Amino acid sequence: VFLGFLGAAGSTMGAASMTLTVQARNLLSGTVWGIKQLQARVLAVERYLRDQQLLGIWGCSGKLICCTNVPWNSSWSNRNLSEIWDNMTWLQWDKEISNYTQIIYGLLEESQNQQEKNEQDLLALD
Amino acid sequence: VFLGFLGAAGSTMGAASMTLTVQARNLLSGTVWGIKQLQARVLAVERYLRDQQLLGIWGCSGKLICCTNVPWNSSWSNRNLSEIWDNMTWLQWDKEISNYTQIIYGLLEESQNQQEKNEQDLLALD
Amino acid sequence: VFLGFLGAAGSTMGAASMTLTVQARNLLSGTVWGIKQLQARVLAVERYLRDQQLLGIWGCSGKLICCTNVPWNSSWSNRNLSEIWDNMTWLQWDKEISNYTQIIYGLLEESQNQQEKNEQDLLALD
Amino acid sequence: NLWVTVYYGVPVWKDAETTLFCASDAKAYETEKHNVWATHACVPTDPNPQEIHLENVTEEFNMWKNNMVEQMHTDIISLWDQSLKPCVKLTPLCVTLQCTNVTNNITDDGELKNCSFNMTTELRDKKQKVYSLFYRLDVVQINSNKEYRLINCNTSAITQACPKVSFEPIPIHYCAPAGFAILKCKDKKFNGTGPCPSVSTVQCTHGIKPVVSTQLLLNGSLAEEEVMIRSENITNNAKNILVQFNTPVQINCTRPNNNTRKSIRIGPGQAFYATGDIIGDIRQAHCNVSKATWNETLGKVVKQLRKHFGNNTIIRFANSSGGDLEVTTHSFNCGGEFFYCNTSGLFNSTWISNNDSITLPCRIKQIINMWQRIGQAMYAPPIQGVIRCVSNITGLILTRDGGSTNSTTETFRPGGGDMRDNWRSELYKYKVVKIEPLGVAPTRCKRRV
Amino acid sequence: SALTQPASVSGSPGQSITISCTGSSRDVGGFDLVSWYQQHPGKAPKLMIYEVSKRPSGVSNRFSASKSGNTASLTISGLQAEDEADYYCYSYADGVAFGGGTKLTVLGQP
Ligand SMILES: *[C@@H]1O[C@H](CO)[C@@H](O[C@@H]2O[C@H](CO)[C@@H](O[C@@H]3O[C@H](CO)[C@@H](O)[C@H](O[C@H]4O[C@H](CO)[C@@H](O)[C@H](O)[C@@H]4O)[C@@H]3O)[C@H](O)[C@H]2NC(C)=O)[C@H](O)[C@H]1NC(C)=O
Ligand SMILES: *[C@@H]1O[C@H](CO)[C@@H](O[C@@H]2O[C@H](CO)[C@@H](O[C@@H]3O[C@H](CO)[C@@H](O)[C@H](O[C@H]4O[C@H](CO)[C@@H](O)[C@H](O)[C@@H]4O)[C@@H]3O)[C@H](O)[C@H]2NC(C)=O)[C@H](O)[C@H]1NC(C)=O
Ligand SMILES: *[C@@H]1O[C@H](CO)[C@@H](O[C@@H]2O[C@H](CO)[C@@H](O[C@@H]3O[C@H](CO)[C@@H](O)[C@H](O)[C@@H]3O)[C@H](O)[C@H]2NC(C)=O)[C@H](O)[C@H]1NC(C)=O
Ligand SMILES: *[C@@H]1O[C@H](CO)[C@@H](O[C@@H]2O[C@H](CO)[C@@H](O[C@@H]3O[C@H](CO)[C@@H](O)[C@H](O)[C@@H]3O)[C@H](O)[C@H]2NC(C)=O)[C@H](O)[C@H]1NC(C)=O
Ligand SMILES: *[C@@H]1O[C@H](CO)[C@@H](O[C@@H]2O[C@H](CO)[C@@H](O[C@@H]3O[C@H](CO)[C@@H](O)[C@H](O)[C@@H]3O)[C@H](O)[C@H]2NC(C)=O)[C@H](O)[C@H]1NC(C)=O
Ligand SMILES: *[C@@H]1O[C@H](CO)[C@@H](O[C@@H]2O[C@H](CO)[C@@H](O)[C@H](O)[C@H]2NC(C)=O)[C@H](O)[C@H]1NC(C)=O
Ligand SMILES: *[C@@H]1O[C@H](CO)[C@@H](O[C@@H]2O[C@H](CO)[C@@H](O)[C@H](O)[C@H]2NC(C)=O)[C@H](O)[C@H]1NC(C)=O
Ligand SMILES: *[C@@H]1O[C@H](CO)[C@@H](O[C@@H]2O[C@H](CO)[C@@H](O)[C@H](O)[C@H]2NC(C)=O)[C@H](O)[C@H]1NC(C)=O
Ligand SMILES: *[C@@H]1O[C@H](CO)[C@@H](O)[C@H](O)[C@H]1NC(C)=O
Ligand SMILES: *[C@@H]1O[C@H](CO)[C@@H](O)[C@H](O)[C@H]1NC(C)=O
Ligand SMILES: *[C@@H]1O[C@H](CO)[C@@H](O)[C@H](O)[C@H]1NC(C)=O
Ligand SMILES: *[C@@H]1O[C@H](CO)[C@@H](O)[C@H](O)[C@H]1NC(C)=O
Ligand SMILES: *[C@@H]1O[C@H](CO)[C@@H](O)[C@H](O)[C@H]1NC(C)=O
Ligand SMILES: *[C@@H]1O[C@H](CO)[C@@H](O)[C@H](O)[C@H]1NC(C)=O
Ligand SMILES: *[C@@H]1O[C@H](CO)[C@@H](O)[C@H](O)[C@H]1NC(C)=O
Ligand SMILES: *[C@@H]1O[C@H](CO)[C@@H](O)[C@H](O)[C@H]1NC(C)=O
Ligand SMILES: *[C@@H]1O[C@H](CO)[C@@H](O)[C@H](O)[C@H]1NC(C)=O
Ligand SMILES: *[C@@H]1O[C@H](CO)[C@@H](O)[C@H](O)[C@H]1NC(C)=O
Ligand SMILES: *[C@@H]1O[C@H](CO)[C@@H](O)[C@H](O)[C@H]1NC(C)=O
Ligand SMILES: *[C@@H]1O[C@H](CO)[C@@H](O)[C@H](O)[C@H]1NC(C)=O
Ligand SMILES: *[C@@H]1O[C@H](CO)[C@@H](O)[C@H](O)[C@H]1NC(C)=O
Ligand SMILES: *[C@@H]1O[C@H](CO)[C@@H](O)[C@H](O)[C@H]1NC(C)=O
Ligand SMILES: *[C@@H]1O[C@H](CO)[C@@H](O)[C@H](O)[C@H]1NC(C)=O
Numbered sequence: 031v032f033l034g035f036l037g038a039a040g041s042t043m044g045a046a047s048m049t050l051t052v053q054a055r056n057l058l059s060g061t062v063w064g065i066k067q068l069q070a071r072v073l074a075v076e077r078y079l080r081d082q083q084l085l086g087i088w089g090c091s092g093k094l095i096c097c098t099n100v101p102w103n104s105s106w107s108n109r110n111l112s113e114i115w116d117n118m119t120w121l122q123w124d125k126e127i128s129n130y131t132q133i134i135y136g137l138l139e140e141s142q143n144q145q146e147k148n149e150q151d152l153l154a155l156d
Numbered sequence: 157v158f159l160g161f162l163g164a165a166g167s168t169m170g171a172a173s174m175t176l177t178v179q180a181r182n183l184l185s186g187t188v189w190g191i192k193q194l195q196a197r198v199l200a201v202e203r204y205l206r207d208q209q210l211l212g213i214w215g216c217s218g219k220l221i222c223c224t225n226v227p228w229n230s231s232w233s234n235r236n237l238s239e240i241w242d243n244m245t246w247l248q249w250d251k252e253i254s255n256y257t258q259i260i261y262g263l264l265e266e267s268q269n270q271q272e273k274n275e276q277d278l279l280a281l282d
Numbered sequence: 283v284f285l286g287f288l289g290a291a292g293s294t295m296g297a298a299s300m301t302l303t304v305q306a307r308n309l310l311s312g313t314v315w316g317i318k319q320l321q322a323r324v325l326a327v328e329r330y331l332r333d334q335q336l337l338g339i340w341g342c343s344g345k346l347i348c349c350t351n352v353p354w355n356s357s358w359s360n361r362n363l364s365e366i367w368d369n370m371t372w373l374q375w376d377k378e379i380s381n382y383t384q385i386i387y388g389l390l391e392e393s394q395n396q397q398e399k400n401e402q403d404l405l406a407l408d
Numbered sequence: 409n410l411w412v413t414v415y416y417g418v419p420v421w422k423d424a425e426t427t428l429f430c431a432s433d434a435k436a437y438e439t440e441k442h443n444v445w446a447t448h449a450c451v452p453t454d455p456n457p458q459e460i461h462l463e464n465v466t467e468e469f470n471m472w473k474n475n476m477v478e479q480m481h482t483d484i485i486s487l488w489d490q491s492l493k494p495c496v497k498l499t500p501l502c503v504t505l506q507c508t509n510v511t512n513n514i515t516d517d518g519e520l521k522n523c524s525f526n527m528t529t530e531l532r533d534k535k536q537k538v539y540s541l542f543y544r545l546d547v548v549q550i551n552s553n554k555e556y557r558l559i560n561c562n563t564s565a566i567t568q569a570c571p572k573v574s575f576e577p578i579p580i581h582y583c584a585p586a587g588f589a590i591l592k593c594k595d596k597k598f599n600g601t602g603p604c605p606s607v608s609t610v611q612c613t614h615g616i617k618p619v620v621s622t623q624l625l626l627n628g629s630l631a632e633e634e635v636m637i638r639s640e641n642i643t644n645n646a647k648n649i650l651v652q653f654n655t656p657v658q659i660n661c662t663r664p665n666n667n668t669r670k671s672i673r674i675g676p677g678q679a680f681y682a683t684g685d686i687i688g689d690i691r692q693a694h695c696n697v698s699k700a701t702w703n704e705t706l707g708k709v710v711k712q713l714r715k716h717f718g719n720n721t722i723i724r725f726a727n728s729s730g731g732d733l734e735v736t737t738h739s740f741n742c743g744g745e746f747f748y749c750n751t752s753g754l755f756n757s758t759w760i761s762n763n764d765s766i767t768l769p770c771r772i773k774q775i776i777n778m779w780q781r782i783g784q785a786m787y788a789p790p791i792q793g794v795i796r797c798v799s800n801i802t803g804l805i806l807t808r809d810g811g812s813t814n815s816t817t818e819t820f821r822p823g824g825g826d827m828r829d830n831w832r833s834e835l836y837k838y839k840v841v842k843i844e845p846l847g848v849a850p851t852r853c854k855r856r857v
Numbered sequence: 858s859a860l861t862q863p864a865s866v867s868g869s870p871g872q873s874i875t876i877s878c879t880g881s882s883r884d885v886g887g888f889d890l891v892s893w894y895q896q897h898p899g900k901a902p903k904l905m906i907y908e909v910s911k912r913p914s915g916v917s918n919r920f921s922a923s924k925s926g927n928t929a930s931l932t933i934s935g936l937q938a939e940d941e942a943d944y945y946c947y948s949y950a951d952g953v954a955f956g957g958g959t960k961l962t963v964l965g966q967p
Contacts, residue, residue, distance in 0.1 A: 032266065047274070048270050048274065049270075050270070051213055051265050051266060051269055051270050054209070054213055055209070055213060055265075057209075058202075058205060058206065058209050060206055068195065068198065069320065071198065071202060072198060072320070072323070072324055072327075075201060075202050075205060075327060076310075076312075076323060076327050078205070078209075079205075079310060079327060079330065079331070080310055080312055083306075083307065083309075083310050083330075084307075086345045087303060087306055087307055087345055087346075091217075091343070091344060091345060092212070092217045093212050093213060093217075093269075094213070094269050094270070094273055095269075095273045095274070095276060095277055097277075097280060139303055139307070140284070140303060143303055143345065143346055144300055144301075144302070144303050144346075147344075147345075147346055147347040148299065148300070148347070150347065151347055151349070151413075151851070151853055154349060154853045154854065154855075155851065155852045155853050156852075158392070173400070174396055174400070176396070177339065177391060177392055177395065177396050180335075180339055181335070181336075181339055181391075183335075184328070184331060184332060184335055186328075186332055194321065194324070197324065197328060198324060200328075201324070201327055201328050201331060204331065204335075205331075217343070218343060218399075219338045219339060219343060219395065219399075220339075220395060220396075220399060221395075221399040221400070221402070221403055223403070223406060285460065286458065286460035286609070287460060287589065287609055288419050288421075288460060288462065288589060288609045288843075289419075289460060289462075290419060291419035291421075291462050291465055291609075292462050292463050292464035292465035293463075293464065295849070298418065298419055299415070301419070302415065302416065302417035302418065302845075303417065305417045305418075305419060305843065305845060306416065306417035306845065308586070309417075309586060309587055309843060309845060310586050310587075311585070311586035313449070314486065314487075314490045315430070315449075315483070315486070315487050315490065316449055318427045318428070318429045318430070318483075319427075319429035319430075319451065319585070321427055322426060322427045322428075322429055322584075322585035323585055323586070325426065325427070325585060325587075326585045326586035326587050326588075329586075329587045329842075330586070330587060333416070333845060333846050336846060337414070337416055337846070340414060341855065342414050342416075345416060345417075346415070346416050346417050347413075347415070347416075348413060348414035348415070348416070349411065349413050349414075349851070349853035349854055349855045350411065350412060350413070350414060350855060351411065351854060351855060352411065352412050353409055353410065353411055353412075354409075354410035354411055354412050354850040363410075363850070363851070363852075366849070366850070367849075371464065372418045372419050372420050372847060373419070373420065373465070375420075375847065375849065376420055376844070376847065379848070383848065386412065386848055390412060390414070390848075398857060401857060402857065405857075643887070643888070643951065645951055645952070810951055810952065811952060812883065812950050812951035812952050812954075813859075815883075815951070
C-alpha cells in the first residue's frame with residue numbers, strides 16, 4: 031500500500047513490511063537564515079549515506095529486504111513469528127529492542143562479511 | 157569508447173548504449189564567491205544520490221544496465237526495436253516519453269520490489 | 283580481529299584482508315571557525331562517494347571483496363602470490379604499483395562492465 | 409592465470425593536507441565566561457581518547473614541512489580577529505594627552521604616565537575631561553609640559569579587546585574529518601624530519617593550549633625522558649633550536665601593583681576601561697625562576713647541544729641581540745594582561761667542560777600588535793588586583809650565531825618571534841594522511857557471467 | 858678574507874677565462890651556496906651567479922660556474938668590453954664570507 035510517508039506507522043510489522051519502498055523515497059527529498067537549508071541538506075545526505083554504509087557492510091548490499099546467516103540469539107526477546115510480526119508494530123518493536131542494535135550490527139558485519147566474503151573468495155580461488 | 161563526457165550524445169540509442177561508462181564516471185567531479193564552489197559540490201553530491209537512490213529502490217540495484225518485470229504498456233509510444241534502438245537517439249527518446257515517466261518510476265519500484273523482492277523472501281522462508 | 287581503525291596496517295596482506303571491516307565503517311564517521319568542519323564533512327561525503335562510485339562503475343557492486351575478469355598483466359611488477367600476500371603489506375604494495383593504478387582502473391571498468399553487462403543483457407535477450 | 413582483484417577498505421594512506429576541525433573538552437564547558445577567546449562552539453571532544461598502536465610500520469615524519477602548523481597558525485589569527493570585531497573601538501581615544509609622571513620619588517626607571525585628556529562623552533555636544541594611567545611603552549611624546557599620544561594610533565586603528573572574554577589558552581584538539589587519520593609518532597628520541605618506527609593512529613591531536621610565549625615556551629608537552637632539541641638544519645645557525653625540556657621549570661610572574669578599572673564611556677554605551685589610580689605600593693613586574701633548577705636545566709641542554717657540535721666545545725648563552733620588544737624579551741600573556749620580561753639573567757652562562765632565584769625585570773604593554781598585523785592593533789584592558797601566575801617552562805627557542813673562524817667557540821642566543829615555532833613544539837609528532845581504501849591485487853579469483 | 862681568490866685575471870675579448878674561489882671544507886665543500894657578484898668600479902655590486910651553477914635572469918648566461926669538492930670556480934665565456942669590472946665570490950661558511958675579488962681586464966693592459 032502507498033499511504034504516504036510513514037503511512038503504515040501504526041500498522042503491524044507484517045503489513046508495514048510492504049510500505050518500505052515509501053519511507054525510503056522520502057529519505058533524501060529529491061547569507062543568513064539560508065545557512066539553515068544548506069546545513070540541513072548536508073546533514074540529511076550524510077545521515078542517509080551513514081545508514082547506507084551500515085547496510086552495505088552487512089550481507090545485504092540492497093534495500094527493502096535482507097537475509098544472512100547470523101542466528102537470532104534466544105536472549106534477544108525469544109518469541110514466535112506471529113508474536114512479533116503480528117502482535118506488535120515497528121515502534122513497540124524497536125522500543126523493546128533498543129538495547130542490542132549496536133552489538134547486533136557489529137556481529138552482523140564482523141561474523142559474516144569478514145568470514146562469508148572471504149569464504150566466497152577462497153571457494154572461487156580454486 | 158572514451159569520447160569524453162556526452163561524447164555519443166547524437167549517436168543512436170543502440171550505439172550510445174556502450175558509452176554509458178564515461179558519462180557515469182564524470183557525474184561526481186571527483187568568503188563570498190567561494191560559496192559558488194561549495195554550494196555547487198553540495199548540489200552534485202545530492203543530485204547524484206537522487207538517481208542512485210531511485211536506481212536502488214527499483215529492481216535494478218546495479219550499474220549502467222537494468223532489466224525488470226514491468227511490461228511495457230503500449231500507450232508509451234508503442235514502436236519496434238529498430239524504430240527506436242537504431243532510428244532514434246536518447247535526446248529524441250525522452251522528449252517523447254517525458255509525459256508518463258513519473259508513473260513508470262512508481263511501477264518500477266512498487267510493483268517490482270514490494271512484489272518480487274517480497275516474493276524472494278517467501279521463496280526463502282517456505 | 284578488531285584492532286581498531288588501521289589496526290593491521292603493518293601486518294601481512296593476507297592477514298590485512300581480515301581487518302577491512304573496521305576501516306570500511308570509519309571512512310564516514312557517522313559563522314567562522316565552524317566552516318572548517320562544514321567544509322570538511324562535505325569533503326568526507328564527497329570523497330567516500332568517489333570510491334563508492336568507482337566500486338560501482340567496476341564489476342564489483344559489492345563491499346570489501348571483488349573479483350573481475352581482467353587478467354593480471356605481467357608488466358605490473360610480475361611476482362608470485364606468496365612473494366606478495368605474505369612478504370608484503372598494503373603499505374608497500376601501492377608504493378610500487380603507483381604507476382598503472384589509473385589505467386588499471388580503466389581496463390577493469392571499460393572491458394568488464396561495458397562488456398559483461400552487455401553480454402548479460404543479450405544473454406537474457408531470448 | 410592471475411586475475412586482478414579489487415579490495416575495498418585496505419589500510420593504505422598517503423601524506424596529504426585538509427581542513428582539520430577542533431575538539432574541546434566538556435569539563436570546562438561550564439566556564440563559557442561569555443565566549444572565551446578560543447572555544448565557543450567547538451564540538452565536544454571524544455569521551456575516550458582511543459589511540460591505536462601500529463607495528464611493522466614506518467612513516468617519514470617532517471615537523472618542518474608539516475602542513476598542520478600552517479593551518480593552526482592561520483586558524484589562531486583568523487580566530488583572533490573574530491574575537492575583536494564585536495569588541496569596542498578606540499578610534500576617538502588618542503587625543504593630545506597631557507601625560508605627567510605618576511606620584512613617585514627619584515630612581516623610577518617613566519613606565520607610568522598619568523595622562524589626562526578630553527574625551528567625547530555619550531552626548532556628542534558635551535565633552536569630558538578624564539584621566540588615565542598609561543605605560544611608557546604605550547605613549548610617545550608628539551612634538552608648557554610634555555604631550556603624548558598612543559603609540560600605535562597612527563599606522564593602525566586601535567581596538568580594545570572587550571574584557572568579557574578571556575585570554576587563557578584552553579586545550580584544543582585539532583581533529584581530522586572522515587577519511588583522514590592523524591598519525592602520532594610515539595618514538596622517544598626523534599627530532600622530527602625522519603622515519604618513525606612507532607606510529608600510533610590516534611583520533612586526533614592531544615589537548616594543545618594556543619599559548620603565545622616565543623622564547624621560554626610555557627604550558628608545553630615535556631620531552632621524552634631527555635631534553636629534545638629540534639632544528640630544521642643544525643648547520644643553519646638561523647634555524648630556531650626548539651629545546652623541549654624533560655622536567656618542568658617553575659616560573660612565578662607577578663603584577664605587584666594593585667590597579668583599578670575606569671571604564672570611561674566614549675560611546676553611547678561604549679566604555680574605554682582605563683587604569684585608575686594604583687592603590688598601594690608602586691613596584692614593577694617580575695618573573696622568578698629557581699636558580700638551582702634553571703642552572704641544572706641549561707646544563708642538561710649543553711650536554712645534549714654538545715652532541716651536534718664537536719666532541720667538546722664551549723657553549724655560551726647571551727641575552728638577545730636586538731629587534732622589536734617582542735623578540736629581545738620574553739613576550740607572553742598570563743593573567744589577561746601582557747608583559748615583556750628581558751631575561752638577561754636567564755642566558756648568561758658559559759660551559760666549557762662540566763638557594764635563590766633569578767628576578768627578571770618585566771615591562772607591561774597594553775597596546776599590542778602581535779603577529780605584526782600592521783593596521784590592526786589591540787588594546788588590552790587592565791586587570792583589577794595583583795596578577796600572580798605560575799607556569800611551567802618546557803621549551804627554549806634558541807638561535808645560533810658565530811663568525812665561524814675555525815669554530816673555536818659557539819654562542820647560543822634566544823629568539824623565535826614567529827609564533828609558528830610555538831606550534832611546532834606541539835605539532836611535531838603529528839601528521840595527517842588521507843585513507844586510500846581502494847586497492848588492486850592479483851589473485852586466482854575470477855567471477856562468473 | 859676566508860675565501861682565497863686570484864688577485865686579478867687578464868684576457869682578451871672573444872676568448873674565455875676562469876676565476877676560482879678556493880676555500881676550506883666548510884664554505885664550498887660543506888654547503889652548496891656559492892655565489893658570484895659583479896661590481897663595476899664605482900657602482901653597486903650586481904649578482905650574476907648564486908647557486909653551484911644556477912644563475913638569475915639578469916646575467917649573461919655565458920657566465921657559468923661549478924663546485925669541485927673544496928674548490929669553487931667560475932668560467933667566463935664570450936668576453937666583451939663591458940665586463941671590465943671586479944667579481945667577488947660568496948659562500949656560506951656558517952655565515953657570510955666574501956672573496957678577495959678579481960679585477961677583470963679585456964682588450965687592455967694587465
Ligand atoms: C607611528 O609612530 C611610531 C612611533 O613614533 C613611528 O615609529 C617610529 O618612527 C620613527 C620615524 O618617524 C623611527 O625613527 C628612527 O629610528 C631610528 C632608530 O632609532 C633612528 O636611527 C632614526 O634616526 C635618523 O636616522 C637617519 C640618520 O641619518 C635618518 O633616516 C633620519 O635623520 C632619522 O631621524 C629615527 O629616529 C622610529 O624608529 C620608529 N620606531 C618606533 C619608536 O616605533 C611610526 O613610524 C609611526 N607611523 C607612521 C608615521 O605612520
Ligand atoms: C599556563 O597555565 C596557567 C594555568 O594556571 C595560566 O595561569 C593562569 O591564568 C589565569 C588566566 O589568565 C589567571 O587568572 C587570573 O589571575 C588573576 C591573578 O591571580 C586573578 O585576579 C583573576 O581572578 C579574577 O579576579 C580579577 C580581579 O577582580 C578579575 O579581573 C578576573 O576577571 C577574575 O575574575 C584570574 O584568576 C591565573 O592567575 C594564572 N595563574 C594560575 C596559577 O592560575 C598561565 O597564564 C598559562 N600560561 C600561558 C603562557 O598561557
Ligand atoms: C593622576 O592624576 C589624576 C588627576 O589629578 C589623579 O586623580 C585625582 O586625584 C585627586 C586626589 O589627588 C582626586 O581628588 C579627590 O577626589 C575625591 C573624590 O571623591 C574628592 O572627594 C576629594 O575632595 C578630591 O577632590 C580626584 O578626584 C582624582 N580624579 C580626578 C578626575 O581628578 C590621580 O590620582 C593621579 N594618579 C595617581 C596614581 O595618583
Ligand atoms: C644584555 O646584557 C647587557 C649587559 O651589559 C645589557 O647592557 C646594559 O643595558 C643597560 C640598559 O640599557 C645599560 O644601562 C644604561 O647605560 C647608559 C650608558 O652607559 C647609561 O647612561 C644609563 O644610565 C644606563 O646605565 C648598560 O650600559 C648596558 N651595558 C652594561 C655596561 O651593562 C643589555 O641591555 C642586555 N640586553 C637585553 C636585550 O636585555
Ligand atoms: C643541513 O644542511 C646541510 C647543507 O645542505 C646538510 O649538509 C649535507 O650533509 C650531508 C651529510 O648529512 C653531506 O653528505 C655527504 O657529503 C660528503 C661530501 O660531499 C660525501 O662524500 C658523502 O657521501 C655525503 O654525500 C652533504 O655533502 C652536505 N651538504 C653539502 C652541500 O655538502 C646537512 O646534512 C643538513 N643537516 C640536517 C640536520 O639536515
Ligand atoms: C580640554 O579642552 C580644553 C579646551 O579649552 C583645554 O583647555 C585649555 O588647555 C590649555 C592647555 O592646558 C590651556 O593653556 C588653556 O588655558 C585651556 N583653556 C581653558 C579655557 O581652560 C584642556 O586643556 C583640554 N584638556 C585636555 C587635557 O585635553
Ligand atoms: C634586562 O635586565 C638587565 C638587568 O641586569 C639589564 O642589564 C642591566 O641594566 C642596567 C640598567 O641601569 C645597567 O646598569 C647594567 O649594567 C645592565 N647589565 C647588567 C649586567 O646588570 C638589561 O639591560 C635589561 N634589558 C632590557 C631592559 O631590555
Ligand atoms: C586592591 O586594593 C583595594 C583597595 O584597598 C582592595 O579592596 C578593598 O577596598 C576597600 C576600599 O578601600 C577596603 O575597605 C577593603 O579592605 C579592600 N580589601 C582588601 C582585601 O584589600 C582590593 O582587595 C585589593 N586587591 C588585591 C588583590 O589586593
Ligand atoms: C492502524 O491499523 C489499521 C489496521 O487495524 C491499519 O489499516 C492502519 O494503517 C494503521 N495505522 C497506521 C498509521 O499504520
Ligand atoms: C547471546 O546472549 C548471551 C547473553 O545472554 C551472550 O553471552 C551471547 O554471546 C549471545 N550470542 C550471540 C549470538 O550474540
Ligand atoms: C539493556 O538491558 C539492561 C538490562 O535490563 C539495562 O540495564 C540497560 O539499560 C538496557 N540498555 C538499553 C535499554 O539501551
Ligand atoms: C553523426 O552522423 C555521422 C554520419 O552518420 C557519423 O559519422 C557520426 O559518427 C555521428 N555522430 C554521432 C555523435 O553519432
Ligand atoms: C496503459 O495505458 C492506459 C491508457 O493510458 C492506462 O489506463 C493504463 O493504466 C496503462 N497501464 C500501465 C501499466 O501504466
Ligand atoms: C501526454 O499525452 C497526451 C496524450 O497523448 C498529449 O496530449 C500530451 O501532450 C502529452 N504530454 C507530453 C508529451 O508532455
Ligand atoms: C606486524 O606483523 C605481525 C605479524 O604477525 C602482525 O600480527 C601485526 O599486526 C603487524 N603490525 C600491525 C599492527 O599491523
Ligand atoms: C600489458 O603491458 C603491455 C606493455 O606495456 C601493454 O601493451 C598491454 O596492453 C598490457 N595489457 C593490459 C592487460 O593492460
Ligand atoms: C611509471 O614508470 C615510468 C618508467 O617506466 C616512469 O617514467 C613514470 O614516471 C612512472 N609513473 C609513475 C611512477 O606514476
Ligand atoms: C618624567 O618623564 C620623563 C620623560 O618621559 C622621564 O625621563 C622621567 O624619568 C620621568 N620621571 C621623573 C622622575 O622625572
Ligand atoms: C632530525 O632533524 C633533521 C632536520 O634536518 C633531519 O635531517 C634528521 O634526519 C632528523 N633525525 C631524525 C632522528 O629523524
Ligand atoms: C612559585 O611559587 C610556588 C608556591 O610558593 C613555589 O612552590 C615554587 O617553587 C615557586 N617557583 C619559583 C620559580 O620560585
Ligand atoms: C649547574 O648545575 C649542574 C647540575 O647540578 C652542574 O653540573 C653545573 O656545574 C652547574 N653550573 C654552574 C655554573 O654552577
Ligand atoms: C647576567 O650576567 C652578568 C655577568 O656576566 C651579571 O652581572 C648580571 O647581573 C646577569 N643578569 C642578571 C639580570 O642578573
Ligand atoms: C605546568 O603548568 C601548566 C599550566 O597550564 C600545566 O599545564 C602543566 O601540566 C604543568 N606541568 C606539569 C608537568 O604538570
